[PDB]
A = this chain, B = another copy of it.
Amino acid sequence: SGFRKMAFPSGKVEGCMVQVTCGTTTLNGLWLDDVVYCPRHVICTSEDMLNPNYEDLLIRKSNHNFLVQAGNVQLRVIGHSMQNCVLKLKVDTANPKTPKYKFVRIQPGQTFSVLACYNGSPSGVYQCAMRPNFTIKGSFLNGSCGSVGFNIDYDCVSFCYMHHMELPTGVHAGTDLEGNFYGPFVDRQTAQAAGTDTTITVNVLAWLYAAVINGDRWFLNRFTTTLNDFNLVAMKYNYEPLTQDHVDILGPLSAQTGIAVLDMCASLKELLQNGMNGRTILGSALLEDEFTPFDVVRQCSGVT
């Protein structure tokens, strides 16, 4: 009973957080095995951020310039390399708390947990969706760079995000763990356009199924629609077009509740055209798109 914006337990990730300092800039690093991963802008001063030549900036740095502290113990840096927008600092000690892990590049619309950190210390954890425009609407302040996003499948942590930058609009941009930015962003102090964003249709449908499972059913109606008809409504309301791939992943929720996907689409169509009329769904007065069909199944079945 109940449905919450649940994050993964952050324990396995907390054991990997370190503080990385280079010159006068300090941020977070991720220590996995004998490598520490962090945003490459740790090598920059504020003046460098205007138009940085990272290759030239990194050349002025040696292993001893990167100070890596795991809690209260100092790591010895024996190598450094830049891969895309991340630095990889080889250390002489493998992290004893390294969980089983993978580096994954998630798709837009997928969700993950963020462990916000400052000075290598965890401050909090929250669940995010990677927006269709490849930004995240996180909660990050100066010093949070290097904080990571992740998912967990039983004992394996799949790291998918490393925080790098705050856009002038207050939304967030970052990379996968190979240092490739999600979206068009560059790690430079320049105003950068995020694409037009859209609402993640398949996620709103999954959340409507979660609402029905938990008893919030007032929005169910006597109607049905087609993918074509629904997509005309999705276009008008800036929702992602629904595809058969999306219908396919909603199958488990359709089977559990007995509500055909296109019937739920008709409820969503009516909610888009008429609003909530002052009512709520799962404690929300808007259509929530930060739960994937997998998240709904996982939470509604109590997967650990």
| Residues of chain A having any CB pair with chain B under 8 Å | 1-11, 14-15, 115-119, 121-126, 137-141, 143-144, 166, 170-172, 214-215, 275-276, 278, 280, 283-286, 298-304
Majority-rule SS of A interface residues: loop
Interchain CB contact under 8 A, A2 and B137: yes
Please report the C-alpha to C-alpha distance between residue A303 and residue B118 in the assembled complex, in whole angstroms.
8
23 CB contacts below 8 A, A to B, read: A1-B170, A2-B171, A4-B138, A4-B139, A5-B5, A6-B126, A7-B126, A9-B124, A11-B122, A118-B304, A122-B304, A123-B298, A124-B299, A137-B283, A141-B301, A141-B302, A143-B302, A170-B214, A275-B278, A276-B285, A280-B286, A284-B285, A285-B286
Question: In the complex, what residues of B have CB within 8 A of residue A117's CB?
Answer: 304
Question: In the complex, what residues of B have CB within 8 A of residue A299's CB?
Answer: 124, 139
Please report the C-alpha to C-alpha distance between residue A9 and residue B12 in the assembled complex, in whole angstroms.
10
Q: Which of B1, B11, B123 contacts A11 (CB 8 A)?
A: B11
Counting chain B CB atoms within 10 Å of each CB, the highest count among A122, A215, A299, A304 belongs to A304
Interchain CB contact under 8 A, B170 and A123: no
* Additional pairs, 8, CB under 8 Å, beyond known A1-B171, A6-B124, A9-B10: A2-B172, A3-B139, A9-B11, A9-B115, A9-B125, A116-B302, A118-B302, A280-B286
Interchain CB contact under 8 A, A170 and B11: no
Q: Which of B6, B119, B124, B300 contacts A8 (CB 8 A)?
A: B124
